[PDB]
Design a protein around this motif. Structure first.
Motif: not given
Lengths: 137, 77, 94, 58
Positions: A20, A26, A35, C51-52, C76, C78-81, C83
């Motif tokens: 990966x 980002x 992306x 959080x919102x 935190x 976070x997995x961007x792939x 989301x």
RNA sequence: GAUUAUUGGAGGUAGAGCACUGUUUGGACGAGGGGCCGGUUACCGAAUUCAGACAAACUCCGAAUGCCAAUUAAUUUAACUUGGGAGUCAGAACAUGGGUGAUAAGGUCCGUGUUCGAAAGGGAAACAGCCCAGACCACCAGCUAAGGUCCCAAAAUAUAUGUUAAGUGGAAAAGGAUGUGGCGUUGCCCAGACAACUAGGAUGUUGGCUUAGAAGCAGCCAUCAUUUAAAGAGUGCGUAAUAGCUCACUAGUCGAGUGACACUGCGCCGAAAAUGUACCGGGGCUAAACAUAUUACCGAAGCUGUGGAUUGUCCUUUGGACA
RNA sequence: UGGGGCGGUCGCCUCCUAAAAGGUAACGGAGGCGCUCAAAGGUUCCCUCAGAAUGGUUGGAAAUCAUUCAUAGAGUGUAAA
RNA sequence: UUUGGCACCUCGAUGUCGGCUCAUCGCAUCCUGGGGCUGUAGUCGGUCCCAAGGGUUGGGCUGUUCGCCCAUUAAAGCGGU
RNA sequence: UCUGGUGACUAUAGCAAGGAGGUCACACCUGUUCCCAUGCCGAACACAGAAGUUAAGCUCCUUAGCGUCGAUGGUAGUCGAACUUACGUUCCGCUAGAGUAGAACGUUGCCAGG
């Protein structure tokens, strides 16, 4: 046409494609980005084509960042000749991208325009892509 | 053609005795270029930067400061 | 600003962690002064709603077993792939 | 305390490390068995070669 | 000697990172050349900084595993020395780590394992190298492995729960679409949603640059009140310009379901090659496919049972106990 | 010798390839040696970077001179480690 | 179906190119057949789809495969064995 | 049990900033007659003194400002196995680096004075 001004070693091992994205996952400079979702090499002409297609649709409007540079040269023997009389001559320059990697960022333009321009860019590339925004939460 | 077909005979560098084993009074412990490992107690340093024991005992690798290492020999028996 | 939490027992393995993530939960920690370090689980959707409503840099009086703790978010993972969030660290400000 | 080990799968197609562990446990042929007392060393051998053996308390 | 447990140690790989080396993208900052009179103005190269990226011949860091060795402990049975006799120096595939090649080759060159070589048997339709498993010899005895249970052809037309409607199963891709399931988030409504009827389509106004006039349209709009429950200096068909009916509104009927996102599992298209169906092995299958579970059975020269050769290590019963 | 030929190479040293012991191939990728030194050897005493600005006769802007950070980026006869 | 790369069968022999005779298969369709769109008025033409039943010339210069030309033809198709 | 001398500990010990102190110690200090010395110079070294100072160094105190150390949890990678051929998946074990909380403005042995 993007390439380095100089390199220590002209002939290099071909990179690795498993895994990966180490980084660059980002958006940092702009509002929207493209992306990657699959793995491949990008060959420094694909970048030019995508940048052109994405620029003209915005019509000297917003701003575009290219988060990718081909540092790595790849070789090619010109004619299909016998195996093994030394390594060949440089043919081009490549960057390797893995899933998660951001390729292009855009700002100073509307969301729909960004989507369409990045779609036009994606169709010029050898990798599956996905539109994304700034991360929040 | 090409002009890259050269290399030198590999020298058998590195550790030759382990931390915790008994050795005799002239045995080689570590061959290297320069001082990766320094000499400690009852350990010498040769012209090839080779490390050897002065006496018979067990060999102990240990640190020297924050970023250096040495070998020592102790005559317990 | 009234989240809940369930305490994770000892020795969570990879399989159970990814089962928990397949479910709507997410692992988390709570550390800081006032309490010792505890490993818990939280509902991702409820955490997102909190959080919102409160903001990124905001306080939450979340419940841990018997009691409640005022707490701020430190970091935190976070997995961007895909989301989704995969881990969250909580810091007790008191 | 006592464990009955039994070799269920063969030892061929497998590496020499596993072969030598099976030999050290006292097993020669398939479906052959052995009885030994429980020690963490025996447990380490078993955990190394568990895909080839079956173990029961006895 | 071998394996494991517990300990100690050498080392710089995978991964990460930018603290050195080099490569790089934006942004600032202000100094030197510069555009000028020794100077403004912009632009260059460099430095310092902010945030982000790259590396086989970069490393502030750094595993797993392998390696060496211990008072070493537990299980096993090798190990070493001397000498007599050899053969061998064309290797192959598979899996994994790599170079080369074109992230081509049943390619080639190294490294780590297995098998074949020199290994029969069962499965993979047939098939040295793949999966299971290592044939001392009899038996019209039994238990299992891998693979399987509609007929060919031994064993479930078994149970339970779903998915698929293409014969997918039983040949790929970028991309394109609905065809269905699942999981969430979110919005739409008896003050009646979502179609569809018709009922309004405007005008001071193309007002202005008024452009071949153009009054939804050379292309820039200035894009203002609103007859009104409700419409725009016209959504929109248009348009040589107009002719524009509504997709800019609503009482009216419709009288109840309704869309967006994500994410996801199956499927469809993209899909053309040559003797003859022509990769499900064949018949044939909507379960006899796929998925998840469970329980039975089958299935090898594997294991067990019964009998028999031969030889070895011990007791020394040389019995042939165990192998 | 990825048929042979033409071409190229044939010994030694250093890196990478090399998979965190050692070792490890290719007509794989990079470079060097076929010496030099009577001090550039031995011993005893002492001493310590560039670069950077700062700033000034000179000024190559920088040569020399002067304060302070600099972490070996100095330097080490000869390639690389 | 090309030019190549590899070097797996064949070196105690697997006949090399053109041409003649004789065919046979595929469709990625040259003609004939059927259709959609057209910047198709008609005449026509262009492009795309379906489709392989049958048919698909004789001469000059070429060793020539290939190519150019002369006259026809509804057409003078591309490939494999 | 204050200071000093001399040793052992991976800087948790350092760097920076701020504030106080001195003839028991420490030091800047005065000078070059002698020992001795500066590829020039008593700057340094060395020598003879104690007129003067706490300013500097040095000691004590304060700050986590830079640097240093640094868990937990989670992740990457990976041994083994099982699916399998996917730029992979699953189960088991080892568990990184970075980052975060946080720690720390040194501990201590011997000796003489005090």
């Amino acid at each position: 046409m993007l390439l380095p001004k100089r390199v220590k070693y002209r002939r290099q091992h071909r990179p690795k494609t498993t895994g990966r994205s180490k980084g660059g996952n980002y958006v940092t400079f702009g509002e929207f980005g493209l992306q990657a979702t699959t793995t491949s090499w990008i060959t420094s002409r694909q970048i030019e084509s995508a940048r052109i297609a994405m620029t003209r649709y915005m019509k000297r409007g917003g701003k575009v960042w290219i988060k990718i540079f081909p540092h790595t040269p790849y070789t090619k023997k010109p004619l299909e000749v016998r195996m093994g009389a030394g390594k060949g001559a440089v043919e081009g320059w490549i960057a390797v991208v893995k899933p998660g990697r951001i390729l292009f960022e855009v700002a100073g333009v509307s969301e729909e325009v960004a989507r369409e321009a990045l779609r036009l860019a994606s169709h010029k590339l050898p990798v599956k892509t996905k539109f994304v925004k700034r991360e929040e939460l | 053609s090409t002009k890259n077909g050269r290399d030198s005979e590999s020298k058998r560098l590195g550790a030759k005795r382990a931390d915790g084993q008994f050795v005799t009074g002239g045995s080689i412990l570590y061959r290297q270029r320069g001082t990766k490992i320094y000499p400690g107690e009852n350990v010498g340093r040769g012209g090839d930067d080779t490390l050897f024991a002065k006496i018979d005992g067990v060999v102990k690798f240990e640190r020297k400061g924050r970023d250096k290492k040495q070998v020592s020999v102790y005559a317990v028996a | 600003a009234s989240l809940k939490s369930i305490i994770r027992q000892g020795k969570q393995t990879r399989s159970d962690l990814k089962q928990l993530r397949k479910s709507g939960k997410v692992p988390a920690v709570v550390y800081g002064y006032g309490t010792k370090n505890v490993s818990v689980k939280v509902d991702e959707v409820e955490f997102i709603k909190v959080i919102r409503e409160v903001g990124r840099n905001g306080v939450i009086e979340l419940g841990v077993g018997s009691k409640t703790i005022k707490v701020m978010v430190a970091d935190y993972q976070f997995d961007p792939l895909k989301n989704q969030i995969t881990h969250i660290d909580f810091l007790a400000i008191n | 305390a006592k464990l009955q080990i039994t070799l269920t799968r063969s030892v061929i197609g497998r590496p020499e490390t596993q072969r030598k562990t099976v030999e050290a446990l006292g097993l020669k042929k398939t479906n052959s068995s052995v009885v030994v007392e429980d020690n963490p060393a025996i447990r380490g051998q078993i955990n190394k070669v568990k895909h080839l053996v079956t173990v029961e308390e006895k």
